[PDB]
Design a protein around this ligand. Structure first.
Ligand SMILES: *[C@@H]1O[C@H](CO)[C@@H](O[C@H]2O[C@H](CO)[C@@H](O[C@H]3O[C@H](CO)[C@@H](O)[C@H](O)[C@@H]3O)[C@H](O)[C@H]2NC(C)=O)[C@H](O)[C@H]1NC(C)=O
Length: 361
């Protein structure tokens, strides 16, 4: 069982305790840690924050306390134009230049692999996406000839039926990717105004349309398109999505006027870190969609959908019963990394819960 964990580079800037560096990571918690978002310039992989070289180095030293740890660097992300990616993949000339530029870069900074986070391929990208992966892996097999351990190659994929049908050739890229991470937590549309859970586990007996929006369906679909169970990694949120109610209605279906208010440390509308949700929970009413098996809390005119220890152990068991390769946790830095915000003196509550379940059988 794999436990891929993402560490986001821009979490250093957060004020107070909110600040997180490679430093705070438990060497023995995850199996793969993915440093989040490198850039591309002149069709060549490159750093993003000025001190990426120092943090790169800082993270890669964890491999000194734990030999078996493996780290990878991710390319793209949400603040990286889709188009920008799409331009590089279409022109074989500019694509080969990018591919040729990765090995070196990783070997120098100490990573054991690359992670592609092209955030959403369009109908016109599917063919090139397949080209990019295919060729990139060929490059990695060829470079292992130099007598060093072959670099890994993976990818962050959407879990939206429509998104997959539109831009991914799952059967084709499944064979060159070392492992695939399903973004099973972006389900409730950024578009419409209705309270809903972004990462539901199950269909949920009460609501006909868009059953395609839950981890279970996303997973069953990928297996059908051709992805091997031994390459799928299911995504698990370590954050919550907030909304500002537009009425005293709190139950499934209630009106919304927009995202929720900012977090004191997170400072971003609509999102809250797990440690912020821990402080928010005080004096809030909790609820739990029994059909989907996922939380939600309300307080004042704020309605928050999130994941606790139990909702997370649940997804972990599911993951196991379908025999998937493992779990993926988005943001170690959104988890209670210090462990001084959520009751129990434990550190990394959620990611640990996933790990305990994974080490069972
Ligand atoms: C990831 O890589 C991007 C592509 O290289 C970087 O971008 C830009 O490259 C230049 C420089 O900023 C931009 O054009 C600017 O350059 C000069 C400064 O010499 C300015 O005078 C001019 O006004 C422009 O700002 C381009 O806009 C841009 N290329 C694009 C956007 O297509 C980008 O900085 C980098 N991202 C980060 C955070 O490193």
């Amino acid at each position: 069982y794999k436990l891929i964990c993402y560490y986001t580079s821009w979490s250093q800037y957060r004020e107070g305790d909110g600040s997180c560096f490679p430093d705070a990571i438990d060497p023995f918690l995850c199996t793969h840690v993915i440093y989040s978002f490198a850039n591309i310039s002149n069709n060549e992989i490159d750093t993003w924050e000025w001190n990426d070289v120092t943090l790169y180095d800082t993270l890669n030293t964890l491999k000194n306390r734990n030999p078996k740890l493996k780290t990878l660097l991710s390319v793209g992300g949400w603040n990286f134009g889709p188009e920008r990616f799409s331009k590089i993949a279409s022109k074989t000339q500019s694509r080969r230049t990018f591919i040729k530029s990765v090995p070196p870069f990783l070997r120098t900074h100490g990573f054991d692999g690359l992670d592609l986070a092209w955030l959403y391929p369009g109908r016109r990208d599917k063919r090139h996406l397949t080209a990019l992966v295919k060729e990139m892996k060929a490059e990695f097999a060829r470079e292992a000839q130099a007598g060093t351990e072959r670099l890994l190659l993976s990818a962050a994929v959407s879990a939206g039926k429509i998104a997959i049908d539109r831009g991914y050739d799952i059967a084709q890229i499944s064979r060159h990717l070392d492992f695939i991470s399903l973004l099973t937590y972006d389900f409730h549309g950024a578009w419409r105004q209705t309270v809903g859970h972004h990462s539901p586990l199950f269909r949920g007996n009460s609501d006909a349309s868009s059953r395609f929006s839950n981890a279970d369906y996303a997973v069953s679909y990928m297996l059908r398109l051709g992805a091997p169970a031994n390459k799928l990694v299911m995504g698990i949120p370590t954050f919550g999505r907030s909304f500002t109610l537009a009425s005293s209605k709190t139950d499934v279906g209630a009106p919304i006027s927009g995202p929720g208010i900012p977090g004191r440390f997170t400072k971003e509308k609509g999102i809250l870190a797990y440690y912020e949700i821990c402080d928010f929970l005080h004096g809030a009413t909790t609820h739990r969609f029994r059909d989907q098996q996922v939380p939600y809390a309300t307080k004042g005119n704020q309605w928050v959908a999130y994941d606790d220890q139990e909702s997370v152990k649940n997804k972990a068991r599911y993951l196991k019963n379908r025999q998937l390769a493992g779990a993926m946790v988005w943001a170690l830095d959104l988890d209670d990394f210090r462990g001084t915000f959520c009751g129990q003196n434990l550190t990394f509550p959620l990611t640990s819960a996933v790990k305990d379940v994974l080490a069972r059988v």
